[PDB]
């Protein structure tokens, strides 16, 4: 029911092969002159977008008819599906708990007289995760209206089934894109530890330089003493080697196997340590690769229902496919970021009690962990906002509290990056209760 | 060929009015026709080849 | 006592693309740490009695 | 392939039945006014 449409609808022509065959006269198209029906193949052969009722050659009153109908059923899976933890029937929130190492005290048999019974609380950090994604896939099948497009019940049942799979393909694709979002959520907040690189595509040296920093980093995650350097909660955590996952794109694996592992005599010395997961890419500017623990993801399912309804008036079904799940990230797990852009000098300042309850008149020590991406000084300046009269944090972060404090305190630590004209503070904060 | 769909956010405030909303599948078709139509011709004079 | 920067640089640049591992390997029992809190100190040879 | 075909091709419309129902104030065609799809049956109904 259209019009004068052409077989050349969505075609940006390159060079008119029909002209180039017949006016070859020496060129490499002279393999095509003995083909008799070449103009017929070179006109229809790409595929026709818009169907036209072609008249028959012998008796023109007949219409040439559709002889075989082909339904192209495909399947899309999820690459990152193996990182999915489990599922939650009941309850919204997940609580992670990490106990951390503590402080040495000097021997003193003089002070140990009255202080037999003094107590230390353990340095415990906790973490919470709520249900986040709450969504559905919806598409209609008007069963009686599509009976005109199908002269058979085989082509009717295969096509309606293909509308089912496009919902389940929309599951595995859209779920894949949230796990690419959790990486780009985490990097945007400054919670990845950034390892600044150069772009590996330019130099083969800059490729091998990049393999140096990753294999350097993948060993630093796996030392039997741990480190506070590769978390965004700054706890002593050792990753095991077999739980490290590298989330390169597809371009860097081809640079690897052709520029390096082709020519290396020993692949065990220039591969990617841990595990290699190859994806589309990363939305962030210059975030080229990412290395995490397998327990970095706190991806849990919640709900997978298919719900149906029928409109008697307009004669259709609506298929609703509800996909609820908790999509979250453990900050107690090691995760780094191989970023080739210009990164800030400090990404993140972490205060070692995020949650403190100080008795009125008491004291509390606070502790910056400045994630410098360079190796500079980066002075940390302390403050207390919301304080009533005194409350006097000083120096390294020893908090004071007055006798007449009842307000809730926010303790801030800051770092001044860049120039004083455009100050651009980097702030880590803590939350202090008063009893 | 039938392509994937778009996600919609769960909301029971808009689920009151849109239970029978009609969202269209993304099907695309091509059409291929007979293109080559030709013959080969070869004569054999048996008796004068003897 | 190898800082993990130098272990990876021995493996990438040197012990790979080389036909003889015993001919370029660091002489001595290699123990890997996360790095020294110092300035520019990278690796350290010591005796066992050090 | 004919590519510019209208539905008419031979038709001398004697009075254009589409406007005739659409202008019916109560004459002969007032029985064709409560039909829903009368415009579509009139469009392709002669083959």
From Swiss-Prot, chain B:
Position of the signal peptide: none
Localization terms from the record: Virion
Coiled-coil region list: 7-27
Task of the protein: Assembles to form a prolate capsid shell of about 54 nm in length and 45 nm in width, with a T=3, Q=5 symmetry.
Subunit (UniProt): Homohexamer. Homopentamer. The prolate capsid is composed of pentamers and hexamers of the capsid protein.
Family, as annotated: Belongs to the phi29likevirus major capsid protein family.
Name of the molecule in the record: Major capsid protein
Native species: Bacillus phage phi29
Lineage: Viruses, Duplodnaviria, Heunggongvirae, Uroviricota, Caudoviricetes
